[PDB]
From a paper:
A deazaflavin-dependent nitroreductase (Ddn) from Mycobacterium tuberculosis catalyzes the reduction of nitroimidazoles such as PA-824, resulting in intracellular release of lethal reactive nitrogen species. The N-terminal 30 residues of Ddn are functionally important but are flexible or access multiple conformations, preventing structural characterization of the full-length, enzymatically active enzyme. The split barrel-like fold is characterized by a central six-stranded antiparallel β barrel in a Greek key topology with four α helices: A at the N terminus (the putative helix removed for Ddn structure determination), B after an extended loop between strands β3 and β4, and C and D between strands β5 and β6. The identification of these residues and the lack of classic catalytic residues in the active site suggest that Ddn functions primarily by precisely orienting PA-824 for efficient direct hydride transfer from F420 and potentially through additional transition-state stabilization.
The full-length structure of a second, inactive homolog, nfa18080 from N. farcinica, was solved by X-ray crystallography in the presence of F420 (rmsd to Holo-1 is 1.1 Å over 109 aligned Cα atoms). The protein core, short N-terminal helix, and coenzyme binding site are conserved for nfa18080 relative to nfa33440. Electron density for the N terminus of nfa18080 starts at residue 5 and approaches the active site of a neighboring monomer in the crystal. The side chain of Y7 of one monomer stacks on top of the exposed Re face of F420 of another monomer at the location where one would expect the enzyme substrate to bind. The homolog structures provide insight into possible orientation of some conserved N-terminal residues in relation to the active site. However, because of low sequence homology (about 20% identity to Ddn residues 1–30) and flexibility of the N-terminal helix, these structures do not provide a reliable model for the missing Ddn N terminus.
Residue numbers in the entry: 5 to 144
The structure:
Amino acid sequence: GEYEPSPSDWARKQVETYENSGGTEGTTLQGKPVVVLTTKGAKTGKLRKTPLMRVEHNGEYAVVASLGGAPKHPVWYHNIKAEPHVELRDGTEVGDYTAREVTGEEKRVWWERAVEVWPDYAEYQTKTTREIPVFVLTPR
Ligand SMILES: C[C@H](OP(=O)(O)OC[C@@H](O)[C@@H](O)[C@@H](O)Cn1c2nc(=O)[nH]c(=O)c-2cc2ccc(O)cc21)C(=O)N[C@@H](CCC(=O)N[C@@H](CCC(=O)O)C(=O)O)C(=O)O
């Protein structure tokens, strides 16, 4: 698409609409649901808000840290590593979670859930040179 913003400017615009509307607008991407993760900034201490694909199961969520399978980690990856207490907004509702990087069978199961929501995640694997981080968020 020739007449679209950069992916970074799109993410900024989406998170702005999402937050300013109290989760009543801007909550989808290609028809698929998006959440807003709030993390504590590792360096600055500021609260940082990031739109991510919604992957949910019985009140837990998972988030995938991957810029299209590229190896450089998103900055919010570092915020979670430093501070596991995060907030997650799903539409009009928000809550507190403990985020942890998962491994093994747990990671495989959540990855399958994520690929059902956002099939492109499977394609990203073909570009990888580092593990793809997956976090599971449990209510707290
Ligand atoms: C460009 C950078 O963003 P980032 O945290 O590297 O994240 C890159 C992307 O993951 C981010 O744009 C995502 O929202 C993109 N994104 C997804 N990204 C994903 O990785 N996974 C997804 O499933 C996903 C879905 C998605 C859906 C909609 C959408 O609009 C965007 C989506 C950024 O926002 N810069 C900030 C960083 C803010 C920050 O947290 N800084 C820390 C720095 C700490 C340190 O560097 O150690 C601080 O304040 O101290 C800034 O500096 O102003």
